[PDB]
Design a protein around this ligand. Structure first.
Ligand SMILES: O=C(COc1ccccc1)Nc1cccc(F)c1
Length: 460
């Protein structure tokens, strides 16, 4: 029975509005409704993994698991296995997988982050799950960010707190936050970004939605504008939105948006918005294709509609050779030529690099670089031809070309990371000097760049 080189992943996000679900929620898991929807001819084909994020979820874990499993069994005639479930307040994540995957999934981690301080600590934050699927690391974040049209900067702060403090994946990757720990990271939830148009325009917005004319609304969506200005979700992807705003509906229909200020809303307007989102970030040159992104039309218990997204994702096998794991394969090596880091810092410490990868027995520390002053005021740290030669555990090109090297540039004075990035080994050539590049981030914000050349030797 061969190991897969691809899987499909379902991501769902639903703010349930503290109400129990209706009897039938299969349309969610089938990717049916508005937007980019799934072909009817796929309805009986199970996804490999289903990841369900809820917010304002009133159910017990047991109650929701029974609904989810019975839903999937009705669709697919498969009894899914529970990989993980984790709840913070009314924010919940469930991961279900085909039974055939039970002995492909390991290293299951869960965590949560509570956002805010005093007044604003007690209901917002995030839950997450990570695991290995054979040779591939997968991370999943369900966040419920701060509400309200005039709190976009709070939402951005919530995002940075969650990616700093959510403890998922391989703890040995100590310089790296969740935005670098996984082959594929999916981040979804009630992100709560709004369409920033004047309150007076509510009925005009409703008109546009009825005409399925979303362009003049999406051009004001706070998540798209904050992402374009590099204020949040740097280096994440989102499929184009082609479904109506998923908030705020009158319950028990989808015919009416309930936007006007009420005591129940704190006298705030809730103009129709795409609060409910799915984004992802995968390592460079790994296959990831969004195959659906939309909302259901027939689940009406909440003031939000459920959102679905599905993906094809590349995975690799748990590779064994006669040498690695448990030794190096001296027929393999990774060399860096003419490498330099460009950093936005004002500091003047010496810096060194750390190279982390599951193709190495353990991480590798470089010598300190040579600081120069860049023409436009920046710090340039030169490594020249000084970087250590990396010794992968396995030399087979079928394995090595699928790997990635995480790079941290650290202060010699504090050993703190000033920037993290990732280089793919999926090169155009082996035994050939080739350009490499990654942006560097710290706490998910841009701090610099790393560029140079690589020379990869495989057994072939
Ligand atoms: O241990 C587990 C997960 O089971 C639990 C235990 C407690 C709460 C939630 C889930 N293994 C597992 C591994 C691979 C695939 C799979 F479907 C399941």
């Amino acid at each position: 029975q061969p190991e897969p080189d691809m899987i499909t992943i379902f991501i769902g996000t639903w703010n349930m509005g503290n109400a129990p679900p209706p009897k039938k929620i299969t349309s969610w898991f089938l990717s049916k409704g508005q937007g980019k929807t799934r072909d009817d001819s796929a309805d009986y084909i199970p996804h490999d993994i289903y990841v369900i994020g809820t917010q304002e979820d009133p159910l017990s874990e047991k109650e929701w698991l029974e609904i989810l499993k019975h839903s999937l069994q009705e669709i697919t005639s498969v009894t899914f296995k529970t990989v993980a479930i984790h709840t913070l307040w009314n924010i919940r994540i469930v991961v279900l997988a085909k039974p055939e995957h039970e002995n492909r999934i390991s290293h299951i981690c869960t965590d949560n982050v509570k956002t805010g301080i005093a007044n604003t600590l007690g209901n917002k934050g995030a839950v997450g799950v990570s695991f290995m699927f054979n040779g591939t690391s997968l991370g999943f974040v369900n966040s419920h960010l701060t509400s309200g049209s005039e709190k976009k900067l709070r939402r951005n702060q919530n995002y940075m707190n969650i990616l700093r403090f959510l403890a998922l994946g391989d703890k040995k990757l100590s310089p790296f936050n969740i935005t670098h720990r996984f082959t594929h990271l999916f981040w979804f939830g009630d992100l709560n970004y709004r369409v920033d148009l004047p309150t007076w325009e509510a009925e005009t917005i409703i008109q546009k939605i009825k005409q399925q004319q979303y362009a003049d609304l999406l051009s004001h969506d706070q998540l798209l504008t904050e992402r374009r200005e590099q204020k949040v979700f740097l280096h994440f992807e989102e499929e184009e939105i082609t479904f109506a705003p998923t908030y705020r509906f009158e319950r028990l229909t989808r015919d009416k948006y309930a936007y006007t200020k009420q005591k129940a809303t704190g006298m705030k307007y809730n103009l129709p918005s795409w609060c409910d989102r799915v984004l992802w970030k995968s390592y460079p040159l790994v296959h990831v294709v969004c195959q659906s992104y939309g909302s259901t039309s027939d689940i009406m218990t909440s003031d939000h509609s459920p959102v679905f997204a599905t993906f094809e994702a590349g995975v690799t096998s748990q590779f064994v050779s006669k040498n690695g794991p448990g030794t190096v394969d001296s027929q393999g090596q990774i060399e860096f030529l003419r490498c330099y880091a460009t950093l936005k810092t004002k500091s003047q410490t010496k810096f060194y690099l750390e190279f982390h990868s599951s193709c190495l027995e353990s991480f590798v520390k470089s010598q300190e670089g040579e600081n120069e002053e860049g023409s436009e005021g920046e710090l340039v740290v030169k490594f020249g031809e000084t970087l250590p030669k990396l010794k992968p555990i396995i030399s087979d090109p079928e394995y090595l070309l699928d790997q990635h090297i995480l790079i941290s540039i650290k202060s010699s004075d504090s050993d703190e990371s000033y920037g993290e990035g990732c280089i793919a080994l999926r090169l155009e050539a082996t035994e050939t000097q080739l350009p490499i590049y990654t942006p560097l981030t710290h706490h998910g914000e841009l701090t610099g760049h790393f560029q140079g050349e690589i020379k990869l030797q495989t057994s072939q």
